[PDB]
Design a protein around this nucleic acid. Sequence first.
RNA 1: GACACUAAGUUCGGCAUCAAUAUGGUGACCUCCCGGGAGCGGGGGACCACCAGGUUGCCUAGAGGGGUGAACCGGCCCAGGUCGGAAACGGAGCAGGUCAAAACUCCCGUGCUGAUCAGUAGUGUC
Length: 87
Amino acid sequence: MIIWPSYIDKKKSRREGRKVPEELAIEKPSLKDIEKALKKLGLEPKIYRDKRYPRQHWEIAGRVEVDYKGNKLCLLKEIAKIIKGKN
RNA sequence: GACACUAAGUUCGGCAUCAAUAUGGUGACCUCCCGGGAGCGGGGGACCACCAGGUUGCCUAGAGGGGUGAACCGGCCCAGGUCGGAAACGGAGCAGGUCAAAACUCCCGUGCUGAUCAGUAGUGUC
Ligand code: MMC
Ligand SMILES: [Mg+2]
Ligand SMILES: [Mg+2]
Ligand SMILES: [Mg+2]
Ligand SMILES: [Mg+2]
Ligand SMILES: [Mg+2]
Ligand SMILES: [Mg+2]
Ligand SMILES: [Mg+2]
Ligand SMILES: [Mg+2]
Ligand SMILES: [Mg+2]
Ligand SMILES: [Mg+2]
Ligand SMILES: [Mg+2]
Ligand SMILES: [Mg+2]
Ligand SMILES: [Mg+2]
Ligand SMILES: [Mg+2]
Ligand SMILES: [Mg+2]
Ligand SMILES: [Mg+2]
Ligand SMILES: [Mg+2]
Ligand SMILES: [Mg+2]
Ligand SMILES: [Mg+2]
Ligand SMILES: [Mg+2]
Ligand SMILES: [Mg+2]
Ligand SMILES: [Mg+2]
Ligand SMILES: [Mg+2]
Ligand SMILES: [Mg+2]
């Protein structure tokens, strides 16, 4: 499973990446936040710093990868909820 | 005879060339879900344009015909580059073309109004 950071960015529109609802989208998603949340779910992430979402080719913001096999969306919503449980 | 008004009859300008509303199609921006290995695929929501269009009736007045570039926004095609991919291909945006539409123009038609002619049509006036 491939998790492009754009999938959870609150600053990005739907057509620009966002796969997660507005109420769950994260302010500044980072590969660590995604790696940490994924590790909190008992999974094993794999960060790839050099790789760019085609909808933002100019921007080199990595991408993580996990073996997970469930609802990609569910997983994403869940990693969004983890990232904010204490301001 | 004379003067009015009521049309119309010339001769030249000035302009206008529907408004108000349902249903349907398409499309950007936005939003939500379902699906997929990545790029992506699919369905819904709202809104605002536009193309079709049933109904309704006032504004000096189930109706047209061309055209152009180009404030801006959009379709479509399609480079180079670039990104995802083993590849097929898919993406973000440009240059390029192209269409639609904003817009502005020309034409025909129907009229309104201004002046100019003459003064026949009709009831008035003295
Ligand atoms: C993991 Hg949902
Ligand atoms: Mg909301
Ligand atoms: Mg943070
Ligand atoms: Mg789609
Ligand atoms: Mg129009
Ligand atoms: Mg028609
Ligand atoms: Mg009718
Ligand atoms: Mg009028
Ligand atoms: Mg009228
Ligand atoms: Mg009149
Ligand atoms: Mg009709
Ligand atoms: Mg655009
Ligand atoms: Mg190319
Ligand atoms: Mg191209
Ligand atoms: Mg093809
Ligand atoms: Mg494209
Ligand atoms: Mg262009
Ligand atoms: Mg050119
Ligand atoms: Mg041309
Ligand atoms: Mg037009
Ligand atoms: Mg003019
Ligand atoms: Mg004109
Ligand atoms: Mg008059
Ligand atoms: Mg007058
Ligand atoms: Mg009498």
